[PDB]
């Protein structure tokens, strides 16, 4: 109990210091200058040069390193882009490098469907919109979103689980705190029909808890218990309904959650 007892002492000491009159006043004074510092430099941010310089240093490529894009800032950013932006023997071995492969068959098919498709372009779309939209719905029990994205096979598994909770009168209200590692793990052909799919992996920090529907008290998990779960998604695109507003064809054939471990 040495670690747990020391943590309570450390938490209480910080709590006493944070709630201390000197500490709270110092924090407020520091926070006030932060508002003044941002306000002083606010006209600089309005300059066209700052917009271009910031778009060079960051460009929005920092999202590879983590972060969760809130649902409101996720829908607005999407609709903004859609309005304007998105609107001898060695030689033989060298020859086999340039030969067609199962990964090349899969990626070429999705390029036929959308001429703009690439691994980098879809990983950006996955990371910024698709994966956060699906993970956030998954932890919060939002079956309206998952109906559009999940196929009839993985959704019927989900809606069967959501029926167990309704029987015991609990509702999922989880959180996603950070999503990392959003990548196209593999591109395979689902045999025997050779259905081109992309296997997508990620690692999301998340708080998994369920509250009783009638009262609201804790029914599972803990309000502060962060887990670093790994998600595997199998994505295919339907040539029909590629004009869909939300999914634009993309569909999830498999959704597996695994590798959950504690984090902070």
């Amino acid at each position, epitope marked *: 109990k040495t670690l747990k007892k020391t943590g309570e002492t450390m938490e209480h000491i910080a709590t006493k210091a944070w709630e201390s009159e000197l500490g709270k006043n110092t924090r407020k004074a520091a926070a006030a200058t932060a508002k003044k510092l941002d306000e002083s430099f606010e006209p600089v941010r309005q300059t066209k040069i700052y917009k271009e310089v910031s778009e060079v240093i960051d460009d929005g490529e920092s999202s590879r390193y983590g972060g969760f894009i809130t649902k409101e800032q996720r829908r607005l950013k999407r609709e903004r882009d859609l309005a304007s932006g998105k609107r001898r023997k060695i030689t033989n071995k060298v020859g086999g490098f340039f*030969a*067609e*492969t*199962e990964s090349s*068959r*899969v990626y070429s*098919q999705f390029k*036929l469907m959308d001429p703009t498709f690439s691994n980098e372009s879809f990983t950006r779309h996955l990371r910024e919109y698709i994966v956060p939209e699906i993970l956030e719905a998954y932890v919060k029990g939002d079956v309206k979103v998952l109906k559009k994205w999940f*196929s*009839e*096979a993985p959704f019927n598994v989900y809606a069967a689980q959501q029926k167990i909770f309704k029987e015991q009168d609990v509702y999922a209200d989880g959180r996603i705190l950070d999503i990392r590692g959003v990548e196209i793990v593999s591109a395979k*052909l689902l*045999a*025997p*029909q*050779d*259905i*081109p799919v992309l296997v997508v992996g990620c690692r999301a920090q998340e708080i998994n808890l369920y509250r009783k529907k009638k009262t609201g008290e804790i029914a599972a998990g803990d309000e502060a218990n962060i887990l670093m779960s790994s998600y595997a998604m199998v994505f*295919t695109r*339907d*040539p*029909e309904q590629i004009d869909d507003d939300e999914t634009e064809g993309w*569909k999830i*054939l498999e959704f597996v959650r695994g590798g959950s471990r504690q984090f902070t």
Partner: antibody
Framework: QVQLKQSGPGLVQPSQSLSITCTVS????????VHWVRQSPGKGLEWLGV???????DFNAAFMSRLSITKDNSKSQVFFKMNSLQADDTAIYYC???????????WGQGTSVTVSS | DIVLTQSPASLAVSLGQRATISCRAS??????????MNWFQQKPGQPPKLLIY???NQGSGVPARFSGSGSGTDFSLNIHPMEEDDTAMYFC?????????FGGGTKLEIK
């Protein structure tokens, strides 16, 4: 480009064996599979068997006891065989490579087989 | 397996008009919501030619005048406008389950 070429015998004697070799070029048998399809005039197109992209075979249930499809990755050849032919087996035999969504995109020229004496 | 009933057995339309060929699978040919219905064309002395795959996707190099539609168990092929060239025998082929089965064929001509 992609090209499937067949080399089999016409005029097969009754109760004999039929052997078509489908020499492929432009693609490798490790990444693509080859359906084997037959077209009779009185029975229309019909599917005999397949060399799946992975290398396993699967046949029509009406011909499984007769068919035998084997490939050879190094030589880019697929071998087709039927143990016994009767007068109803006279037709044109195609090897059709299948791609995404099992689309038989490229076809062999066809082997016009006759079963008589 | 799945018995694809294809109608009409014969069809005659003039140049420039729309010719529609129907297929009716006995069962549903959908896997993951994608209907595996391929459409083929066969000139008299040549192997079949893939026109449509996955019920709507044009084959490599297939003219834009060949349209595939339908879902569930009812499918269609529309040639519009129809040229003098594409008079041939048209087949529907389900790729859902083994054995693969072809339609009876539709002989399409000129008036």
């Amino acid at each position: 480009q992609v090209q499937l070429k067949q080399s089999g015998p016409g005029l097969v004697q009754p109760s004999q064996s039929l052997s078509i070799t489908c020499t492929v070029s432009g693609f490798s048998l490790t990444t693509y599979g080859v359906h084997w399809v037959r077209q009779s005039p009185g029975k229309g197109l019909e599917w005999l068997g397949v060399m799946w992209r992975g290398g396993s075979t699967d046949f029509n249930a009406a011909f499984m006891s007769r068919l035998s499809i084997t490939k050879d990755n190094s030589k880019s050849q697929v071998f087709f065989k039927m143990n016994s032919l009767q007068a109803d087996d006279t037709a044109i035999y195609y090897c059709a490579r299948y791609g995404n969504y099992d689309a038989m995109d490229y076809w062999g020229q066809g082997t016009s087989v006759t079963v008589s004496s | 397996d799945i018995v694809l009933t294809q109608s009409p057995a014969s069809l005659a339309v003039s140049l420039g008009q729309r010719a529609t060929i129907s297929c009716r699978a006995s069962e549903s040919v959908d896997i993951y919501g994608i209907s595996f219905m391929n459409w083929f064309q066969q000139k008299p002395g040549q192997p079949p030619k893939l026109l449509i795959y996955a019920t709507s996707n044009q084959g490599s190099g297939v003219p834009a005048r060949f349209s595939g539609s339908g879902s569930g168990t009812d499918f269609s092929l529309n040639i519009h406008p129809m040229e003098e060239d594409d008079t041939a025998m048209y087949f529907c082929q389900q790729s859902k389950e083994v054995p693969r089965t072809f339609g009876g064929g539709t002989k399409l001509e000129i008036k």
